[PDB]
Symmetry: C2
Subunit: 284 residues, 2 copies
């Protein structure tokens, strides 16, 4: 987040084998409610990450001849996409900031207009949500749909706000509220997100909130994945990087955002808990 997005894309694909199945289950619940034009239009994926939802989930489910455009503010992610999950003739991985001042000067804008825009687990990394909904509203054809997978609240955000009070850190965390989801302290996340979408010319067709778990088979891939989604590590020097992490990870099982379980085969299971708002809108 902030300066670029999630660097180190290698550590993030450790959650592919789990995050792929999660969004693949969310989209299956909404895919029947999605209407499509006769002649296909380009489809956009915002905050595509290492391009696994774009390649392994979105692309197999799109109609034939539908071209896909996947963007991410972090370069390292978009280069990881074009090298591993690179799907020729369908997916075109590009760079874009969803709250770009000059959207009309980007490659993604001129690939448009787009029929559908999938914005998955990335709108919590955007402090200015209404500006991001605006730019998505510019990119959609009238009648085009948008699919949101916004994270309402999670213990990772509170662990950020608790660490921001440490004079040890503090200096690097003066803007902690801009690294926290805007629906973190919201008493009604579904209502505020339904109001925000409709306040930008959208027809909210469906909007629900539920808990989610992120499965990890091994112990270290649970740890190494949390290294990537730690948004403050790019500001900390090396002598305190490994200390910011342990301070963070300790404050997580305190807040019970992460957990460890047992398997039917007896093996150890590792989890990450968080709430997700799922939305389906349509431009007028």
């Amino acid at each position: 987040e902030a300066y670029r997005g999630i660097d180190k894309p290698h550590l993030y694909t450790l959650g592919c084998c789990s995050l792929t199945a999660m969004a693949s289950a969310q989209l299956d619940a909404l895919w029947s409610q999605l209407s499509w034009p006769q002649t296909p239009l380009p489809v956009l994926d915002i905050g595509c990450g290492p391009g696994d939802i774009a390649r392994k989930v979105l692309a197999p489910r799109l109609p034939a001849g539908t071209r896909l455009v996947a963007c991410d503010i972090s370069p390292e992610m978009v280069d990881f996409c074009r090298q591993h999950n690179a799907l020729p003739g369908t997916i075109t991985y590009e760079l874009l900031d969803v709250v770009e001042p000059r959207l009309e000067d980007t490659v993604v804008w001129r690939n448009g207009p787009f029929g559908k825009v999938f914005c998955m687990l990335m709108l919590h990394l955007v402090p200015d949500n209404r500006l991001a909904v605006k730019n998505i509203h510019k990119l959609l054809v009238p009648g085009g749909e948008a699919v949101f997978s916004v994270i309402a609240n999670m213990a990772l955000c509170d662990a950020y706000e608790e660490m921001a009070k440490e004079p040890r850190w503090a200096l690097y965390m003066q803007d902690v509220e801009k690294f926290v989801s805007p629906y973190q302290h919201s008493e009604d996340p579904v209502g505020e997100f339904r109001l925000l979408l409709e306040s930008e010319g959208f027809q909210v067709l469906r909007c629900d909130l539920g808990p989610q778990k992120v499965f990890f088979p091994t112990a270290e891939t649970h740890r190494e994945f949390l290294k990537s989604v730690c948004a403050f590590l790019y500001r900390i020097p090396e002598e305190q990087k490994d200390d910011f992490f342990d301070d963070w990870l300790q404050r997580l099982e305190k807040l019970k955002g992460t957990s460890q379980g047992v398997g039917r085969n007896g093996e150890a299971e590792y989890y990450i808990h968080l709430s997700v708002i799922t939305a389906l809108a349509r431009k007028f």
Copy 2:
């Protein structure tokens, strides 16, 4: 004996890469696949942890078709029903592809199957003609079988070199049954095409090519090779960790495993092996 691959937790470390690989192979063949008007059940033999079924097969299947995935090991068949469980579509059962009494299995009576997928497993089945004959039984006349057999790989040569060690020879007396039969084949595509046609199949397409399995971290590359090591279940604990290091060291000797660099500067870990891809049809 070999009750397939246990420790399913370690195998899903290759899902994030094996999913994209088998997804790429099917895209090269999916145009040549005919489908019936009324859907018939589709079978995935040796499905593993249900990843090349929930995320690869079922998404692109004709709506209304039902998938049946079967492994030989309960641990995998148990991993699927928990994680990659897709109700109303994929059913995960247990089956040995060379079962003496196929007709007494649940998989046999969910059939007959329109299509049968077989990805990276026939190199674990010594009697390959028996497994092809069983696949021929399960298919409807006109059905199609999609094979993904590993012709040769350095994991097998490392096995045959470790069998010569008196340190291990007691556990590795049947080393030729833990090696793909097409390992020492001078023409794997020819033998496989002849094997399929000798069982009533019409080989529509058959190619051989090298493939690569990528792992982003160092230990996921290591922990995955723990699962695909077929001799670890025979070794006592005092020599298990020594058997793995002896295996891993011989792998970079034979250059089956490699390591690379990333555009962002990160380390890349690989596993190299040859794959036969086939598309047959029952008469």
